[PDB]
UniProtKB/Swiss-Prot annotation, chain A:
Highest taxon listed in the record's lineage: Viruses
Full-protein residues shown: 66 to 116 of 521
Protein name, as recorded: Major capsid protein
Gene: gp23
Subunit note: Homohexamer. Interacts with the portal protein. Interacts with the capsid vertex protein that forms pentamers. Interacts with hoc; one hoc molecule associates with each capsid hexamer. Interacts with soc; this interaction reinforces the capsid structure. A total of 960 subunits of the major capsid protein forms the 160 hexamers.
Phylogenetic classification of the source organism: Viruses, Duplodnaviria, Heunggongvirae, Uroviricota, Caudoviricetes
Post-translational modification: A proteolytic cleavage by the prohead core protein protease gives rise to the mature major capsid protein during virus maturation.
Homology family: Belongs to the Tevenvirinae major capsid protein family.
From Swiss-Prot, chain B:
Family, similarity comment: Belongs to the Tevenvirinae capsid vertex family.
Name used for this protein in its record: Capsid vertex protein
Function description: Capsid protein that self-associates to form pentons, building the capsid in association with hexamers of the major capsid protein and one dodecamer of the portal protein. The capsid vertex protein self-associates to form 11 pentons, building the T=13 laevo capsid in association with 160 hexamers of the major capsid protein.
Organism of provenance: Enterobacteria phage T4 (Bacteriophage T4)
Signal peptide as annotated in the record: none
Post-translational modification: Proteolytic cleavage at the N-terminus by the prohead core protein protease gives rise to the mature capsid vertex protein.
Primary gene name: 24
Summary of subunit composition and partner proteins: Homopentamer. Interacts with the portal protein. Interacts with the major capsid protein that forms 160 hexamers.
Lineage: Viruses, Duplodnaviria, Heunggongvirae, Uroviricota, Caudoviricetes
Amino acid sequence: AEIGGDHGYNATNIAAGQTSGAVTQIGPAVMGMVRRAIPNLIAFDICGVQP
Amino acid sequence: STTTNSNSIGRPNLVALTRATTKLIYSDIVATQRTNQPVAAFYGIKYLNPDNE
Protein backbone atom coordinates (compact mmCIF):
# COMPACT_ATOMS: atom_id res chain seq x y z
CA ALA A 1 0.00 0.00 0.00
CA GLU A 2 2.41 2.62 -1.27
CA ILE A 3 1.80 6.22 -2.33
CA GLY A 4 3.36 7.87 -5.36
CA GLY A 5 2.36 11.32 -4.24
CA ASP A 6 2.49 14.62 -6.05
CA HIS A 7 4.72 17.61 -5.89
CA GLY A 8 3.13 20.32 -3.87
CA TYR A 9 2.50 22.10 -7.19
CA ASN A 10 4.76 24.70 -5.62
CA ALA A 11 7.14 25.67 -8.41
CA THR A 12 9.96 25.23 -5.89
CA ASN A 13 9.27 21.55 -5.22
CA ILE A 14 8.52 20.56 -8.79
CA ALA A 15 11.93 21.81 -9.93
CA ALA A 16 13.85 20.09 -7.14
CA GLY A 17 11.84 16.89 -7.47
CA GLN A 18 10.55 16.90 -3.89
CA THR A 19 7.52 14.64 -3.69
CA SER A 20 5.07 13.74 -0.94
CA GLY A 21 5.08 10.15 -2.21
CA ALA A 22 7.58 7.32 -2.31
CA VAL A 23 9.71 8.59 -5.20
CA THR A 24 11.51 11.87 -5.87
CA GLN A 25 11.95 12.25 -9.61
CA ILE A 26 15.29 13.39 -10.97
CA GLY A 27 13.65 16.57 -12.15
CA PRO A 28 11.27 18.26 -14.49
CA ALA A 29 12.25 16.60 -17.80
CA VAL A 30 12.73 19.35 -20.40
CA MET A 31 10.15 20.57 -22.87
CA GLY A 32 12.62 22.72 -24.81
CA MET A 33 13.77 26.30 -24.87
CA VAL A 34 11.67 29.28 -25.91
CA ARG A 35 13.85 32.04 -27.28
CA ARG A 36 12.67 35.55 -28.11
CA ALA A 37 12.17 36.37 -31.76
CA ILE A 38 14.66 38.61 -33.55
CA PRO A 39 12.71 41.67 -34.71
CA ASN A 40 12.89 42.72 -38.32
CA LEU A 41 14.83 45.38 -40.16
CA ILE A 42 13.00 47.92 -42.33
CA ALA A 43 15.95 47.60 -44.72
CA PHE A 44 17.46 50.64 -46.40
CA ASP A 45 15.49 51.41 -49.57
CA ILE A 46 13.84 54.23 -47.60
CA CYS A 47 17.09 56.21 -47.60
CA GLY A 48 19.87 56.51 -50.15
CA VAL A 49 22.76 54.28 -49.18
CA GLN A 50 26.04 55.03 -50.94
CA PRO A 51 28.42 52.58 -49.23
CA SER B 1 103.03 20.30 -13.78
CA THR B 2 99.64 20.81 -15.40
CA THR B 3 97.02 19.49 -13.03
CA THR B 4 93.28 19.75 -12.62
CA ASN B 5 93.95 23.16 -11.06
CA SER B 6 94.81 24.55 -14.48
CA ASN B 7 91.93 22.93 -16.37
CA SER B 8 88.62 24.80 -16.07
CA ILE B 9 85.32 22.93 -16.12
CA GLY B 10 82.86 24.12 -18.74
CA ARG B 11 79.50 22.75 -17.59
CA PRO B 12 78.20 20.10 -15.26
CA ASN B 13 76.79 16.89 -16.62
CA LEU B 14 73.08 17.11 -15.94
CA VAL B 15 72.90 13.56 -14.54
CA ALA B 16 69.51 13.25 -12.82
CA LEU B 17 66.42 15.44 -12.49
CA THR B 18 63.96 15.06 -9.61
CA ARG B 19 60.47 16.49 -9.24
CA ALA B 20 58.89 15.55 -5.93
CA THR B 21 55.23 14.59 -6.20
CA THR B 22 53.09 12.45 -3.92
CA LYS B 23 51.79 9.12 -4.97
CA LEU B 24 48.31 10.50 -5.53
CA ILE B 25 45.29 8.53 -4.47
CA TYR B 26 42.03 9.97 -5.54
CA SER B 27 41.60 7.24 -8.13
CA ASP B 28 41.46 4.20 -5.87
CA ILE B 29 39.84 5.81 -2.85
CA VAL B 30 36.62 7.23 -4.29
CA ALA B 31 33.91 6.00 -6.62
CA THR B 32 33.90 8.20 -9.71
CA GLN B 33 31.36 8.51 -12.50
CA ARG B 34 31.47 11.58 -14.71
CA THR B 35 28.49 13.96 -14.75
CA ASN B 36 27.04 15.30 -17.99
CA GLN B 37 25.26 18.20 -16.28
CA PRO B 38 26.36 20.78 -13.70
CA VAL B 39 24.28 19.13 -10.98
CA ALA B 40 24.64 15.45 -10.14
CA ALA B 41 21.81 13.56 -8.47
CA PHE B 42 22.67 10.21 -6.95
CA TYR B 43 19.60 8.27 -6.16
CA GLY B 44 19.70 5.89 -3.34
CA ILE B 45 16.85 3.51 -2.92
CA LYS B 46 16.01 1.92 0.38
CA TYR B 47 14.15 -1.32 0.95
CA LEU B 48 12.11 -0.75 4.08
CA ASN B 49 9.97 -2.76 6.47
CA PRO B 50 6.39 -1.83 7.30
CA ASP B 51 8.21 -0.04 10.16
CA ASN B 52 10.23 2.06 7.67
CA GLU B 53 13.64 0.97 8.93
